[PDB]
Amino acid sequence: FEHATTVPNVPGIPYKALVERAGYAPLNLEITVVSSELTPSTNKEYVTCKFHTVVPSPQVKCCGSLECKASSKADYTCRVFGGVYPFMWGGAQCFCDSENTQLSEAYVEFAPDCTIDHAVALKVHTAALKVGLRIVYGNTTARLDTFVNGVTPGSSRDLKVIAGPISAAFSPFDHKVVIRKGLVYNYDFPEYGAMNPGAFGDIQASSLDATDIVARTDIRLLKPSVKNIHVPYTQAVSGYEMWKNNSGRPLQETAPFGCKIEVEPLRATNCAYGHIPISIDIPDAAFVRSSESPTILEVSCTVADCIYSADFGGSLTLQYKANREGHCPVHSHSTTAVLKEATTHVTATGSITLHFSTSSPQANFIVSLCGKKTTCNAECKPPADHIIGEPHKVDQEFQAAVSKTSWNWLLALFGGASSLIVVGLIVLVCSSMLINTR
Amino acid sequence: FEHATTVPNVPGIPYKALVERAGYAPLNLEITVVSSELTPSTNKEYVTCKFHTVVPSPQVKCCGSLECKASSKADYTCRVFGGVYPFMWGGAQCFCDSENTQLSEAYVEFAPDCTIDHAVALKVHTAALKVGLRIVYGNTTARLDTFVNGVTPGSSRDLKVIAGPISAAFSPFDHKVVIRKGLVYNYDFPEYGAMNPGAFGDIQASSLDATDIVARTDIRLLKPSVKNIHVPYTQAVSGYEMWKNNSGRPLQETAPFGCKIEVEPLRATNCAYGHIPISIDIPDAAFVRSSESPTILEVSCTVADCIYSADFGGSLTLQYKANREGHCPVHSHSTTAVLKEATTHVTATGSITLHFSTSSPQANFIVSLCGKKTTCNAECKPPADHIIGEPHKVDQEFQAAVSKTSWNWLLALFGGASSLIVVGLIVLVCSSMLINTR
Numbered sequence: 001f002e003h004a005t006t007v008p009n010v011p012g013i014p015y016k017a018l019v020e021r022a023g024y025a026p027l028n029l030e031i032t033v034v035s036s037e038l039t040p041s042t043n044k045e046y047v048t049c050k051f052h053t054v055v056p057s058p059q060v061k062c063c064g065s066l067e068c069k070a071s072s073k074a075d076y077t078c079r080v081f082g083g084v085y086p087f088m089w090g091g092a093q094c095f096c097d098s099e100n101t102q103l104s105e106a107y108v109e110f111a112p113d114c115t116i117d118h119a120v121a122l123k124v125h126t127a128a129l130k131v132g133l134r135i136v137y138g139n140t141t142a143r144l145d146t147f148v149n150g151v152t153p154g155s156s157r158d159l160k161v162i163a164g165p166i167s168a169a170f171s172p173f174d175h176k177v178v179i180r181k182g183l184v185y186n187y188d189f190p191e192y193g194a195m196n197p198g199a200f201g202d203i204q205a206s207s208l209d210a211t212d213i214v215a216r217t218d219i220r221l222l223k224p225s226v227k228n229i230h231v232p233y234t235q236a237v238s239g240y241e242m243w244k245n246n247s248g249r250p251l252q253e254t255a256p257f258g259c260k261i262e263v264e265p266l267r268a269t270n271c272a273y274g275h276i277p278i279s280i281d282i283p284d285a286a287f288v289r290s291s292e293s294p295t296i297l298e299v300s301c302t303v304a305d306c307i308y309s310a311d312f313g314g315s316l317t318l319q320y321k322a323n324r325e326g327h328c329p330v331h332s333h334s335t336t337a338v339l340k341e342a343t344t345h346v347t348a349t350g351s352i353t354l355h356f357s358t359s360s361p362q363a364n365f366i367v368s369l370c371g372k373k374t375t376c377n378a379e380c381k382p383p384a385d386h387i388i389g390e391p392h393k394v395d396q397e398f399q400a401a402v403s404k405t406s407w408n409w410l411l412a413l414f415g416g417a418s419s420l421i422v423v424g425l426i427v428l429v430c431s432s433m434l435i436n437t438r
Numbered sequence: 439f440e441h442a443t444t445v446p447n448v449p450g451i452p453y454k455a456l457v458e459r460a461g462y463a464p465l466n467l468e469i470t471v472v473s474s475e476l477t478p479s480t481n482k483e484y485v486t487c488k489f490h491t492v493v494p495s496p497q498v499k500c501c502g503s504l505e506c507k508a509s510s511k512a513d514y515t516c517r518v519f520g521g522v523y524p525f526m527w528g529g530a531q532c533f534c535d536s537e538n539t540q541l542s543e544a545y546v547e548f549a550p551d552c553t554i555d556h557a558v559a560l561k562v563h564t565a566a567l568k569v570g571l572r573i574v575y576g577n578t579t580a581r582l583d584t585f586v587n588g589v590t591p592g593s594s595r596d597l598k599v600i601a602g603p604i605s606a607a608f609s610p611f612d613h614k615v616v617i618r619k620g621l622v623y624n625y626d627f628p629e630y631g632a633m634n635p636g637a638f639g640d641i642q643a644s645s646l647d648a649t650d651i652v653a654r655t656d657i658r659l660l661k662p663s664v665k666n667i668h669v670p671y672t673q674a675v676s677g678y679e680m681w682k683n684n685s686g687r688p689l690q691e692t693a694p695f696g697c698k699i700e701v702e703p704l705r706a707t708n709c710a711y712g713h714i715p716i717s718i719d720i721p722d723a724a725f726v727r728s729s730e731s732p733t734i735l736e737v738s739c740t741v742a743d744c745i746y747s748a749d750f751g752g753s754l755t756l757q758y759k760a761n762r763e764g765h766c767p768v769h770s771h772s773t774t775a776v777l778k779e780a781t782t783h784v785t786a787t788g789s790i791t792l793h794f795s796t797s798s799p800q801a802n803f804i805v806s807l808c809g810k811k812t813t814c815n816a817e818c819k820p821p822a823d824h825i826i827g828e829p830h831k832v833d834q835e836f837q838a839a840v841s842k843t844s845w846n847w848l849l850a851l852f853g854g855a856s857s858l859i860v861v862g863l864i865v866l867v868c869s870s871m872l873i874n875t876r
């Protein structure tokens with residue numbers, strides 16, 4: 001058989017539904033969202049980390065001349081000076097008032113520790129969802145996993161069940177993000193080849209060990225100092241450490257709907273929001289002919305007690321008469337309240353007690369046992385404890401919290417003087433005619 | 439110095455512009471789009487190719503029983519039969535009217551040739567552009583390459599020149615595409631894990647040699663035939679060959695703007711459309727003080743001849759008087775027409791001939807030599823040849839094809855009888871007053 005139904009996005013909340021077919025008992029279908037897996041599409045842009053500068057041995061020409069060449073090293077720079085007398089422990093290596101010249105150069109490369117301290121800039125897009133479901137029909141359980149896209153059915157027993165699309169798309173990921181040491185930070189990094197001294201992503205590389213590298217961090221060389229050979233240099237602090245000191249808090253502590261986010265897939269998990277439609281195909285073998293199912297007689301509904309609460313705090317009682325033995329499912333045809341158990345042993349004249357919960361204190365609804373059903377009305381009270389994190393609001397409110405007493409007061413309240421007004425107008429017309437008699 | 443200017447997207451079309459500074463000769467700047475490189479962002483979804491089925495040696499139980507197990511092979515299926523008498527050249531291996539049983543199984547894997555015949559489904563998005571430019575300022579040439587994004591300046595001589603964003607985004611790539619043997623076909627492939635027998639992408643794999651594989655192509659086993667052991671099977675033709683017979687023509691022959699598309703970067707090249715703004719910084723050293731530049735006197739414009747055409751079919755002549763020797767640039771301050779050369783040797787009283795082209799046959803405009811300028815008016819005729827692919831329409835039309843004669847006819851055409859109407863009304867008022875005199 002075939003059926004369809006919509007379920008809200010939420011993990012570990014069984015929903016119980018019925019499929020009705022004349023001549024066959026209505027099977028109880030249990031649907032649970034075991035887990036959620038939102039996986040977007042990712043693109044790698046470039047890596048970055050703390051950098052180490054290079055101060056190579058200088059190129060000193062004793063009583064000659066030199067120049068400022070070019071090279072492919074990232075942040076490569078050169079500069080030359082003349083009339084320099086460098087010294088050293090053995091003495092002065094060379095002195096020529098003008099002919100001496102010194103040439104210095106500088107570049108940079110990722111530090112050796114970068115291999116593990118590196119962060120990466122990611123371009124993300126097109127959030128896609130993967131959902132794991134547990135579906136039980138007639139004590140026939142099945143574990144399945146599928147995308148929410150309406151095209152693909154996940155394979156479980158070769159039963160193709162379609163679902164989606166998502167009611168409303170939610171994505172804590174911004175189009176641009178950064179990843180570091182298992183943490184994901186929402187940030188707007190600059191484009192590849194776009195750098196700013198003292199800013200994040202001052203150094204770039206397609207790979208952690210790629211030979212090609214590019215950066216720009218305001219490295220201007222300084223003139224040689226007094227009498228001692230060295231290379232006085234200058235450069236702005238790494239943007240990596242700066243951004244680290246002020247990167248902001250991780251997205252782990254800011255995502256809505258309690259997302260659980262992991263890096264190696266760059267995905268979210270157990271993050272719930274929205275609703276999903278589902279199409280379900282069922283073999284007719286699983287179905288049971290009604291005559292095989294037991295029949296019931298003169299069943300009554302009795303509310304032992306019920307306090308409005310969050311857990312299955314509502315309790316009900318049922319007295320039934322039957323001509324057969326076996327099992328029947330039970331269902332709450334009214335959405336406002338939902339049971340906790342599916343079926344139970346039956347009896348010729350036995351009675352049972354049932355658990356349930358509701359979104360309103362007004363326990364007025366109808367409930368079905370076997371194929372028959374009976375009404376159930378009562379009042380439930382709010383609880384004392386008002387703070388718990390266990391599953392709650394399994395059903396959303398439908399402005400049905402309005403008590404029957406409030407409806408009674410409202411109905412008798414609204415006036416109907418307009419009828420008196422019309423009667424007054426009619427008698428006015430008749431009296432006007434009578435006066436016209438004169 | 440700094441300047442800005444917008445240029446249309448087109449390859450190999452030098453544009454000549456001027457930067458004006460009092461006390462400095464206006465340098466001639468030449469801008470050419472050497473090439474274009476549009477590179478989008480790509481995501482790999484799954485591979486596919488022709489498949490080969492597997493018919494393993496059957497599992498035959500001589501006078502016993504068997505079952506239909508499960509396995510992880512793609513399209514794995516099993517089926518069993520009983521009461522079978524298989525035969526073979528040495529005779530009948532076993533016969534038991536009922537106790538004999540036969541079990542067959544079937545699956546599939548990518549064919550060995552797939553390694554080179556494989557096609558891949560790609561998810562593309564976020565088209566990005568890379569542009570190569572050649573810029574010449576004062577016989578100072580520079581070859582640069584940069585993105586059109588307004589943030590990143592390409593590096594060439596360490597001269598940061600920004601450009602973009604694109605005036606209008608164009609992308610022949612659909613969000614979904616397929617690649618095969620160096621060809622790119624625009625197609626809407628199904629999602630990973632979504633298959634249909636006889637349809638494209640019936641077999642999937644994250645890698646060409648990934649052990650994991652999934653497919654569904656309607657493989658139902660057939661009952662054993664008469665007296666001869668074998669495995670009669672059935673299955674639908676590969677969607678790969680079907681799509682090949684009807685894949686449609688390559689995108690190479692359908693993309694607009696003459697895109698040249700390559701696969702290993704999945705990029706387009708030399709595909710022109712739209713306009714791009716550009717910001718250009720220039721060292722003041724390149725600039726030349728005006729006094730250093732030669733001065734000119736009483737220069738006249740003379741049109742030797744001009745036929746409206748596509749190439750530099752317009753010819754002009756200039757007679758000048760100068761007090762200095764050297765060089766000056768020339769420019770067409772009117773967009774409708776553009777020169778072909780930048781500068782020339784100067785003389786105290788010499789004269790020169792110049793080439794140019796235009797988008798209108800009306801050669802009315804002003805042209806600047808050194809810092810001074812002179813007007814130039816004339817009429818150009820359409821050409822005889824009307825079919826050529828060489829660069830043309832270097833300037834877009836600005837409804838200026840309207841000839842001066844047409845304007846003359848239009849001006850004298852439109853009437854002004856409303857003035858006669860007002861005069862008639864005024865004389866009517868005066869005559870009405872005179873009649874009121876009576």
Ligand SMILES: *[C@@H]1O[C@H](CO)[C@@H](O)[C@H](O)[C@H]1NC(C)=O
Nearest residue numbers: 137138139140288326327328
């Ligand atoms: C499921 O219930 C049916 C009767 O409703 C019973 O015949 C069957 O054995 C049950 N299956 C399991 C696995 O309990």
Ligand SMILES: *[C@@H]1O[C@H](CO)[C@@H](O)[C@H](O)[C@H]1NC(C)=O
Nearest residue numbers: 575576577578726764765766
């Ligand atoms: C460029 O032109 C200037 C004068 O306009 C000249 O001094 C210089 O040598 C030229 N450079 C080259 C490379 O021709």
